[PDB]
Amino acid sequence: SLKYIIGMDVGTTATKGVLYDINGKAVASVSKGYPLIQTKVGQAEEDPKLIFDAVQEIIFDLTQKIDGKIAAISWSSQMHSLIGLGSDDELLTNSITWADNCAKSIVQDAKNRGFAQQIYRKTGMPMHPMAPIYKLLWLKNKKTEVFSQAQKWIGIKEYIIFRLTGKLVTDTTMAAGTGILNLKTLTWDQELLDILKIKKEQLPKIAQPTKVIFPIKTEYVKKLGIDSDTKIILGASDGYLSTIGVNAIDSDHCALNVGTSGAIRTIVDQPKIDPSASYFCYPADKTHYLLGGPVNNGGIVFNWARQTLFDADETPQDFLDVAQTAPAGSRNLIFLPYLGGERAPIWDANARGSFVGLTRMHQKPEMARAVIEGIIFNLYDAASNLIKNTKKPVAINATGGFLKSDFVRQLCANIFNVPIVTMKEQQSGTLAAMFLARQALGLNQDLSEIGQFAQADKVYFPNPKEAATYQKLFPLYCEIRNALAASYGKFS
């Protein structure tokens, strides 16, 4: 009689399961990881069966923890993953994650012919090999065999649901990450299908994220410890769900999440692409489009700095404390954070990091702070691409282990010059997935109602003097970024 919803988040190295009660309160959570197959450079795959096994195990462990009915299982999932199915519905490939670079030459050449520009103009997909469309082109031209026999081209979410249900369905937000979904029609772009030599039929049908997929094959109903009336909610992408999961549901807001890597996103009225293609446009539905930039150089870069700038025994707090002993602006020291190449905002895989403007006035503190300001300046750089020619958001809804400290939160406010709102719940994806279920179940109607579950915690307001300092220092950051943009290829 007690009813529960399970929100699943199928990540790159782990799935996280969270069990909510009919009130939306998370009562338990279990996650299990899997290896990412990286035999050689650029390769980033994973075994779908591995992933599904974790999935069953997670759900079952969650059901063990309560005595009641699992009303629905909802899904948040990594994006850009690609899996091929045979005529037997058997796995022709592993899950080729967004991180796999196999298609990296295809992109460059497509980019050379003005074709990548066209895909982007049509689908809102940045010119990057993370996209299935590019992954497919590569398979069609260097793995002709498996491409020949592929009857279905799907992603890990489609795959999991198909295992449980015998249905091949994807949601709009997930399709938005293939590079094949037309922005205007919100269906597969025929022109692209023809060039891919793929058929509308070899692709999941597209539905709303709230679609109920019923029923679950009895095999798993038993295995997973659920009922015969446990609904599967189609779910959506981690990118979309993480944004609505921090209550960033309209253009007046945006979501900034920063962990090891980070992301800035906002949701808008209509498609909206960038002349420079510096941000993605992933449709959710006809009146909701996710704009954003994935940013590689988040806390991963902070940790690099922590260690090489000091030593391996330098705590993150030690680093923050030292950084703080330097003035805001780090006496005009610029740090371009592009350690691992970069997607948004510069979309250059060859990019490297730089310290520019060194002087004998710049000591350890100044370099410490410049790192953190650089990481933040870069995120602000990506955010700014989103909202140029439009109204600045009224707040940034913030999450991520990198934003854990008051200092970084305050620094973000001061750099972005809008208030920074930290959220009570970091797990935006499973929360928003859980919310989708509540919609499907008729427990909630409008998206705005998700605000009830996604609560604000702390607000940080821009400090006027520092804000002015950073507003004057940002253009210099962009000068140095611009100055070096063309130089990174030289490095190899």
From TrEMBL:
<dbReference type="GO" id="GO:0005524">
    <property type="term" value="F:ATP binding"/>
</dbReference>
<feature type="binding site">
    <location>
        <position position="299"/>
    </location>
    <ligand>
        <name>ATP</name>
    </ligand>
</feature>
<keyword id="KW-0067">ATP-binding</keyword>
<dbReference type="InterPro" id="IPR018483">
    <property type="entry name" value="Carb_kinase_FGGY_CS"/>
</dbReference>
<feature type="binding site">
    <location>
        <position position="260"/>
    </location>
    <ligand>
        <name>ATP</name>
    </ligand>
</feature>
<dbReference type="InterPro" id="IPR043129">
    <property type="entry name" value="ATPase_NBD"/>
</dbReference>
<protein>
    <submittedName>
        <fullName>Gluconate kinase</fullName>
        <ecNumber>2.7.1.12</ecNumber>
    </submittedName>
</protein>
<feature type="binding site">
    <location>
        <position position="299"/>
    </location>
    <ligand>
        <name>ADP</name>
    </ligand>
</feature>
<dbReference type="Pfam" id="PF02782">
    <property type="entry name" value="FGGY_C"/>
</dbReference>
<keyword id="KW-0808">Transferase</keyword>
<comment type="similarity">
    <text>Belongs to the FGGY kinase family.</text>
</comment>
<feature type="binding site">
    <location>
        <position position="401"/>
    </location>
    <ligand>
        <name>ATP</name>
    </ligand>
</feature>
<keyword id="KW-0418">Kinase</keyword>
<dbReference type="InterPro" id="IPR050406">
    <property type="entry name" value="FGGY_Carb_Kinase"/>
</dbReference>
<feature type="domain" description="Carbohydrate kinase FGGY N-terminal">
    <location>
        <begin position="4"/>
        <end position="245"/>
    </location>
</feature>
<dbReference type="GO" id="GO:0005975">
    <property type="term" value="P:carbohydrate metabolic process"/>
</dbReference>
<dbReference type="InterPro" id="IPR018484">
    <property type="entry name" value="FGGY_N"/>
</dbReference>
<keyword id="KW-0547">Nucleotide-binding</keyword>
<dbReference type="GO" id="GO:0046316">
    <property type="term" value="F:gluconokinase activity"/>
</dbReference>
<feature type="binding site">
    <location>
        <position position="401"/>
    </location>
    <ligand>
        <name>ADP</name>
    </ligand>
</feature>
<feature type="domain" description="Carbohydrate kinase FGGY C-terminal">
    <location>
        <begin position="255"/>
        <end position="437"/>
    </location>
</feature>
<dbReference type="InterPro" id="IPR018485">
    <property type="entry name" value="FGGY_C"/>
</dbReference>
<dbReference type="InterPro" id="IPR000577">
    <property type="entry name" value="Carb_kinase_FGGY"/>
</dbReference>
<feature type="binding site">
    <location>
        <position position="260"/>
    </location>
    <ligand>
        <name>ADP</name>
    </ligand>
</feature>
<dbReference type="Pfam" id="PF00370">
    <property type="entry name" value="FGGY_N"/>
</dbReference>
